[PDB]
Amino acid sequence: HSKKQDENIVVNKFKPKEPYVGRCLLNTKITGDDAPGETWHMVFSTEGEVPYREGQSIGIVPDGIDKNGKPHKLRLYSIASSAIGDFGDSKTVSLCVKRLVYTNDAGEVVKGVCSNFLCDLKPGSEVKITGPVGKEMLMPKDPNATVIMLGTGTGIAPFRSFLWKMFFEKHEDYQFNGLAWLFLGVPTSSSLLYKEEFEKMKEKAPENFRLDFAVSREQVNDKGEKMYIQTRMAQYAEELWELLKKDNTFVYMCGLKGMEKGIDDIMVSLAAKDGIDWIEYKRTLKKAEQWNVEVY
Instruction: Using CB under 6 A, list all residues that contact ligand FAD.
Output: 57, 75-78, 96-98, 100, 102, 112-115, 154, 157, 294, 296
Long-range contacts formed by 227-233: CB under 8 A, 24+ apart = 228/185, 228/262, 229/150, 229/152, 229/183, 229/184, 229/185, 229/259, 229/262, 229/263, 230/262, 230/263, 230/265, 230/266, 232/183, 232/185, 233/150, 233/183, 233/263, 233/266
What is the widest separation between alpha-carbon atoms in the chain? 58
Q: Tell me if 61 sits within 8 A of 53, measured CB to CB.
A: no
**From the candidates 52, 77, 194, 252, which is the catalytic residue?**
77
Quote the least distance from Cβ 97 to ligand FAD, whole Å.
Answer: 4
Tell which residue, 287, 285, 7, 1, has the closest CA to residue 139.
7
**Is position 296 annotated as part of the catalytic site?**
yes
254 labelled catalytic? yes
252 is catalytic: no
Nearer to ligand FAD, 187 or 208 (CB): 187
Instruction: Give the residue with the Cβ less far from ligand FAD, 76 or 205.
Output: 76
Residue number with CB closer to ligand FAD (48 or 102): 102
Does residue 255 have a known ligand-binding role?
A: yes
Task: For the beta carbon of residue 138, count every other beta carbon within 10 angstroms.
Answer: 22
Q: How far is the CB of 115 from ligand FAD (least distance, A)?
A: 3
- Residue 87, Cβ density class (10 Å: 0-12 exposed, 13-18 middle, ≥19 buried): middle
The answer to the question of whether 75 is labelled as a binding residue is yes
Name the minimum Å distance from CB 114 to ligand FAD: 3
Q: Which residues, 6+ apart, have CB-to-CB distance to 119 below 8 Å?
A: 27, 29, 38, 40, 97, 99
Smallest gap from residue 202 Cβ to ligand FAD (A): 23
Tell me whether residue 29 or residue 102 sits nearer to ligand FAD (CB atom): 102
Q: Rounded to 5 degrees, what are φ and ψ at 267?
A: -60, -30
Catalytic residue among 45, 78, 94, 191: 78
Nearest distance, CB of residue 128 and ligand FAD, angstroms: 14
Which residues does the annotation place in the binding site?
A: 75-78, 96-98, 102, 113-115, 154, 186-187, 216-217, 226, 255-256, 294
Which residues does the annotation place in the binding site for NADP(+)?
A: 78, 98, 154, 186-187, 216-217, 226, 255-256, 294
* Residues designated as active site: 77-78, 254, 294, 296
